[PDB]
């Protein structure tokens, strides 16, 4: 059973947000 704190959850949410931004940016650059 994996256990995390609140700070790991915050960091993982921020990493997901950043990953979505980089996915959009890579899509924009590849399209152009």
């Amino acid at each position: 059973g994996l256990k995390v704190g609140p700070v790991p959850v915050l960091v993982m949410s921020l990493l997901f947000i950043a990953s979505v931004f980089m996915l959009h940016i890579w899509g924009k650059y590849t399209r152009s």
Partner: protein
């Protein structure tokens, strides 16, 4: 299924207690994370011009079309209902299974959303972009579950559902009030926020005041006044309570007061009514759009209804609608009040707040009503609690229809949800302050 249930992230319980200030800070951090996640558009979306099939689910689920939080609080509600049914039909394994079923229903709902017809044409997207959107919504639902667990294990004041719903409604109201978005259709730059529009019109140009008050195509200042009035009225009616003078018998020296609030079920009637009506709306839209006289009776969708059961459930669009169709307004008001009363009276027996359950709680803890015997404790509760619940539901429905008729900002259901959830957070504030 044990390995499958245990292969899931979980938040460590705070063995050491957390002060109220840190709980508030973590609640604010979770709120900020959800707010950022509900404004980030999804990747791979081809088009967002079609009508929203689940537009009526947005307020109740605290969602935003096209963003990561488009499913919203759906995983939490679905998992909770699924395991409530499972428990009815027959310890951390329970939480693990709840998380697993929430993820499964999140995958299913994401598949339905992608295949619904929005995001452009799924066939043109291909199995790649659709799968990528499914992964994004899966991770968003996992984040929602993690944030709800963060708020419920002890790091946060309230639950995730209530906080997210209240935050979405409050953000919608404040945006409609102060949005700096400019919209023009041949009449100059008209600001989309009512107060900012008032300032802009006063600076640019009496006529400005009347335009800012009766601006039909945009948020009004009269609508803001109605919203403030509904806030005040709902707060005043939420302050209503019945204080039962009680003592202790099992152990002496404990004195206290037992309040039976008028809004005995705080927002559960609103949540149940909104979920039922919005589900009916979604089913009616999908059924009429896809492909019968009975379907027409379920509602002649045209997007607002122009006939049918869903029309009779819909609030009147204007005073002219009531004038031309008084029967529709009467049926709508009657259904609101009756559904609220019936849902509250059902919930007080389902959620273990029945007069019998409260009497058993009094008897086990050794609580006795002052001036009344121990045997007749249930009788006074039988006199008070059922009427309290029924009239609380009826008053909630009356406030909702009053706010809808006044054209309040954020809808009557939204305003009632916001006020009730904020009052729950206020009573949490006072509880943690006194403790």
């Amino acid at each position: 299924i044990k390995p499958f249930c245990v292969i899931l992230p979980e938040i460590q319980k705070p063995e050491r207690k957390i002060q109220f200030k840190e709980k508030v800070l973590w609640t604010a951090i979770t709120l900020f994370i959800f707010l950022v996640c509900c404004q980030i558009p999804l990747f791979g979306i081809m088009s967002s011009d079609s009508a929203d099939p689940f537009y009526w689910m947005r307020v109740i689920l605290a969602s935003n079309r096209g963003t990561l939080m488009e499913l919203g609080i759906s995983p939490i509600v679905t998992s909770g209902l699924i395991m409530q049914l499972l428990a009815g039909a027959k310890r951390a394994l329970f939480n693990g299974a709840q998380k697993l079923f929430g993820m499964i229903i999140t995958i299913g709902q994401s598949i339905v959303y992608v295949m619904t017809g929005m995001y452009g044409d799924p066939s043109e997207m291909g199995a790649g972009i659709c799968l990528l959107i499914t992964i994004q919504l899966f991770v968003a639902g996992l984040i929602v579950l993690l944030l709800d667990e963060l708020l419920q294990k002890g790091y946060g004041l309230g639950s995730g559902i209530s906080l997210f719903i209240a935050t979405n409604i409050c953000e919608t109201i404040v945006w409609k009030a102060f949005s700096p978005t400019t919209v023009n259709t041949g009449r100059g730059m008209e600001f989309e926020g009512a107060i900012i529009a008032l300032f802009h019109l006063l600076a640019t140009r009496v006529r400005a005041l009347r335009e800012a008050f009766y601006r039909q195509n945009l948020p009004n200042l009269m609508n803001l006044i109605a919203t403030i009035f509904v806030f005040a009225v709902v707060i005043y009616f939420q302050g209503f309570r019945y204080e039962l003078p009680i003592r202790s018998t099992k152990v002496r020296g404990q004195i206290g007061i037992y309040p039976i609030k008028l809004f005995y079920t705080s927002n559960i009637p609103i949540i149940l009514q909104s979920a039922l009506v919005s589900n009916l709306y979604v089913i009616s839209q999908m059924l009429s759009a896809r492909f019968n006289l009975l379907v027409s009776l379920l509602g002649t969708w045209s997007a607002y209804p122009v006939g049918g059961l869903c029309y009779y459930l819909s609030p009147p669009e204007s005073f002219g609608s009531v004038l031309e169709d008084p029967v529709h307004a009467v049926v709508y008001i009657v259904f609101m009040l009756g559904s609220c009363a019936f849902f509250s009276k059902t919930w007080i027996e389902v959620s273990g707040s029945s007069p019998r359950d409260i009497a058993k709680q009094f008897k086990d803890q050794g609580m006795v009503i002052n001036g009344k015997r121990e045997t007749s404790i249930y009788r006074e509760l039988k006199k008070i609690i059922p009427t309290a619940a029924a009239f609380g539901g009826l008053c909630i429905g009356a406030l909702s229809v009053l706010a809808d008729f006044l054209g309040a900002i954020g809808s009557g259901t939204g305003i009632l949800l916001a006020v009730t959830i904020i009052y729950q957070y206020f009573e949490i504030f006072v509880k943690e302050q006194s403790e």
